[PDB]
Amino acid sequence: KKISGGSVVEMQGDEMTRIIWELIKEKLIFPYVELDLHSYDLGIENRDATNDQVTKDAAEAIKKHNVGVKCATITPDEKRVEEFKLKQMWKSPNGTIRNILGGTVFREAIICKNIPRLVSGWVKPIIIGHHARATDFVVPGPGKVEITYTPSDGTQKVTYLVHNFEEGGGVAMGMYNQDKSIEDFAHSSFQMALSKGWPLYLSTKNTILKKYDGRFKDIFQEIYDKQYKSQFEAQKIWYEHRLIDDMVAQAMKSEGGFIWACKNSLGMMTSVLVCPDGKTVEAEAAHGTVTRHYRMYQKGQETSTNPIASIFAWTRGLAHRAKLDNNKELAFFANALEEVSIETIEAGFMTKDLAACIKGLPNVQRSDYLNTFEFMDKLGENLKIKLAQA
Amino acid sequence: KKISGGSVVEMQGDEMTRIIWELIKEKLIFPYVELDLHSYDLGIENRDATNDQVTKDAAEAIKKHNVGVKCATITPDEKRVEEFKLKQMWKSPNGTIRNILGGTVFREAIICKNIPRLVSGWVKPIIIGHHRATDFVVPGPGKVEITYTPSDGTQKVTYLVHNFEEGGGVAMGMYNQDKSIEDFAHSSFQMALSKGWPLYLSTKNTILKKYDGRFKDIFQEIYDKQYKSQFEAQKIWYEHRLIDDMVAQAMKSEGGFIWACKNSLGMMTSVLVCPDGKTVEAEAAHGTVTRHYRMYQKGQETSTNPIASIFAWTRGLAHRAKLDNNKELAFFANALEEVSIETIEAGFMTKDLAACIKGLPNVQRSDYLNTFEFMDKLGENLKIKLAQAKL
Ligand SMILES: NC(=O)c1ccc[n+]([C@@H]2O[C@H](COP(=O)([O-])OP(=O)(O)OC[C@H]3O[C@@H](n4cnc5c(N)ncnc54)[C@H](OP(=O)(O)O)[C@@H]3O)[C@@H](O)[C@H]2O)c1
Ligand SMILES: NC(=O)c1ccc[n+]([C@@H]2O[C@H](COP(=O)([O-])OP(=O)(O)OC[C@H]3O[C@@H](n4cnc5c(N)ncnc54)[C@H](OP(=O)(O)O)[C@@H]3O)[C@@H](O)[C@H]2O)c1
Ligand SMILES: CC(C)(C#N)c1ccc2c(c1)N(C(=O)c1ccc([C@](C)(O)C(F)(F)F)cc1)Cc1cccnc1N2
Ligand SMILES: CC(C)(C#N)c1ccc2c(c1)N(C(=O)c1ccc([C@](C)(O)C(F)(F)F)cc1)Cc1cccnc1N2
């Protein structure tokens, strides 16, 4: 009997990623996991036919079901509009989903011992989270541009000069940040550091943008001391604020294995939308539809597409589903599939792009790699073995 | 006889960079070039003693003479104020200089075939040029507004930034004058013509329609009016690209372009290009190398990369040669650059470069040269090159 995986929101995509995603479900997921699958077809032709309604329904389903796994999608431009005879230049599905869910996007790399890194020292992954609008206008000629704060109680009026335009003419803007979104960024970051079991670090440039960045420093520390310090110290983890330059320096000498909150190959990186509630998660590969490889596929040429980032979208999603449902069998599966993926590459079985990382593209010969299907087949074989050895 | 190099403004700096600057002058520049040298000592102690007058004069001289070659200098902080017993926390000389001359800073990397880059495909350098904010905390609920009061007495314009209801946050105001955008466009077109490379402007005009749109419009207006012809005459062009489409292009490219951005260190040069196309100031895109200097102070062996500093001299000397139609100096500036690249490419390099190839834990003493041994090697290869060129 198969593992009962529960409720998962799955989104189908476009081009090469649409092919590999089906191979993942057919060869790696479905032979072992039964899911109450909420499928949405985010393929370009379907978004056009539904007037982008499928994207909104998918976003609402992730809100309801807490777990979303997304395949890469075509973000339309003038050329895509002509190519698919699009009714409109549809907004990116990623933006629509982000806007409906909110949360912080964390980008984590998949580390392989035989695959080179930017810094050889990096043995454990570095998870980077970026913060998650503005009033811009033209200054037609000379005169003063000021920004003013007036409290609701009306007991004060502070006025700061932005600039006194003298030779005159230019541009000016006003931008803000509410306390809640700084807190949401801290909560997502603290909950991310607990789940991964690694220390969290907040980087800032509060030397220049003193007051703006200083609020981020203060809100993080207050949230830590008031609801996180206990569990961090009780797991050998910690929270520490570092300045941009002191952070980039310490990370260059580090072994990795930390959460990096930022206030400002390729088939080996994932992107995870972590909502502040710690309940909802949306996982996806941090790469596109791989158009070039799709064109080769359409011309009958052999392709060697890296499916790792897409497999890790599934494993991260399933691992979160297992955490929410206290499902040990699913938790074991998600991790076993991650181990099989790493082990296969470390054993010398990989796609062209990875062989190119090691040897160098001009020194890569057919025997140095596996094609899309050969690679998927080797993963499926290795997963059967690892799972049979229960 | 030596080459008559003409008028050059030279600024002496601090720490390890001051030591190497003297070696470049003695071993590489002075044995071949005679200059009408306008030397200013921008060492911390001298700036303190003259109450920062030396810095203001140095910038004044670059305005008059058009060519500036600068050594890295200490920007003081509380620790530096105590270390030297400074009268003030003096403002960065680079800040004082830039403010006086105006212009755009362009960062270019020196490429060696045996030294790894971000994208291995990057054979030709990528020259990046970069283009003032009032921030405060919002304690609780209330209105944040941004106003424009015309100087001609016409109606005041008020924009709501945010009405904080749940209360609490942070706010800021930014601006940009048209003259600054015009100067940014000019320096960029000037830089692209000089290198004979295409120019790209990256902006976020989809989000910042009015703000970044003024940048896109000003660059096109200037391009179409005074640069379209000259660019086409050199089989070169200028194009606006949205940030994301620009990074995707650059990563899939072989380099060899200028990038106007509206947002090892031993191998990076920083060049300040004034909008006039006549005034240029060059320096290494790195600091004084305090760490190596302390070792030198304790009589310990150092291995400091002089490339960035040598290229400050070469870019300055190439600009001087261009202004004065001085073929001999133009040839010398190129020869010094080639001898620097070729020396590294032959296996003779400093520790940081050896570490790029082999990795810091695997670096042995036999893989690199100390500061002096490297300068001696460049000196020896420079003498050979210039002798061979006589044909
Ligand atoms: N999250 C999303 O849904 C998302 C994100 C970005 C872009 N896109 C969309 O995808 C389409 C095309 O994107 P693109 O060609 O710009 O970017 P891309 O799909 O990331 O791929 C660009 C290149 O990077 C390499 N690459 C990326 N993923 C790979 C993998 N798994 N295995 C092997 N090589 C891989 C390939 O290089 P080589 O050709 O050198 O092997 C590929 O041609 C667009 O229509 C865009 O809107 C979607
Ligand atoms: N444009 C300027 O004038 C400028 C710019 C930045 C900083 N600074 C000033 O310089 C002082 C200290 O600088 P810093 O130590 O922060 O920065 P830095 O001199 O750029 O170098 C920092 C570290 O990077 C390595 N490094 C940099 N340049 C190198 C080279 N040419 N060859 C070999 N290794 C090199 C060294 O580390 P290893 O020991 O690991 O080799 C060095 O200790 C400050 O007081 C600051 O004000 C000036
Ligand atoms: C895409 C990105 C930047 C995000 N979000 C990102 C997120 C996570 C990881 C990377 C990149 N990897 C890097 O090579 C890398 C590049 C640049 C920088 C910085 C910030 O630019 C620094 F250099 F300043 F540190 C930091 C890390 C791969 C990698 C490799 C090994 C272990 N972990 C990781 N993690
Ligand atoms: C210091 C800096 C960032 C500026 N100003 C800069 C200016 C020029 C060059 C670099 C860095 N080099 C890079 O490796 C690099 C890093 C990041 C990025 C981007 C834009 O951030 C990208 F990542 F988005 F592409 C672009 C280029 C070295 C290099 C190497 C080979 C040929 N040319 C260059 N030129």
UniProtKB/Swiss-Prot annotation, chain A:
Q: Name one GO cellular component term.
A: extracellular exosome
Residues making up the signal peptide according to the UniProt record:
none
A Pfam family annotated for this chain is Iso_dh
Localization, per the record, is:
Cytoplasm, Cytosol; Peroxisome
Q: Which Gene3D superfamilies match?
A: Isopropylmalate Dehydrogenase (3.40.718.10)
List the residue(s) that the UniProt entry marks as the site Critical for catalysis.
K205
EC number(s) on file: 1.1.1.42
Kindly list the positions at which Phosphoserine occurs in this protein: S367
Please give the residue positions where the record annotates the modification N6-succinyllysine.
Answer: K124, K378
> Where does the UniProt entry say this protein principally localizes?
cytoplasm
UniProt binding sites for Mn(2+): D245
Q: Which domain of life is it from?
A: Eukaryota
Ordered alphabetically, the record's keywords are: Acetylation, Cytoplasm, Glyoxylate bypass, Magnesium, Manganese, Metal-binding, NADP, Oxidoreductase, Peroxisome, Phosphoprotein, Tricarboxylic acid cycle
Identify which cofactors the protein needs according to its UniProt entry: Mg(2+); Mn(2+)
GO MF: cadherin binding; identical protein binding; isocitrate dehydrogenase (NADP+) activity; magnesium ion binding; NAD binding; NADP binding; protein homodimerization activity
Reaction it catalyzes: D-threo-isocitrate + NADP(+) = 2-oxoglutarate + CO2 + NADPH
Post-translational modification N6-acetyllysine, affected residues: K79, K217, K226, K236, K299
What family is reported? Belongs to the isocitrate and isopropylmalate dehydrogenases family.
Q: What does this protein do?
A: Catalyzes the NADP(+)-dependent oxidative decarboxylation of isocitrate (D-threo-isocitrate) to 2-ketoglutarate (2-oxoglutarate), which is required by other enzymes such as the phytanoyl-CoA dioxygenase. Plays a critical role in the generation of NADPH, an important cofactor in many biosynthesis pathways. May act as a corneal epithelial crystallin and may be involved in maintaining corneal epithelial transparency.
Q: Which NCBIfam families match?
A: nadp_idh_euk, PRK08299.1
Name the associated disease, please. Answer: Glioma: Gliomas are benign or malignant central nervous system neoplasms derived from glial cells. They comprise astrocytomas and glioblastoma multiforme that are derived from astrocytes, oligodendrogliomas derived from oligodendrocytes and ependymomas derived from ependymocytes. Genetic variations are associated with cartilaginous tumors such as enchondroma or chondrosarcoma. Instead, alpha-ketoglutarate is converted to R(-)-2-hydroxyglutarate.
- Quote the protein name from its UniProt record: Isocitrate dehydrogenase [NADP] cytoplasmic
- The species is Homo sapiens (Human)
Organism lineage string: Eukaryota, Metazoa, Chordata, Craniata, Vertebrata
Q: Which gene encodes it?
A: IDH1
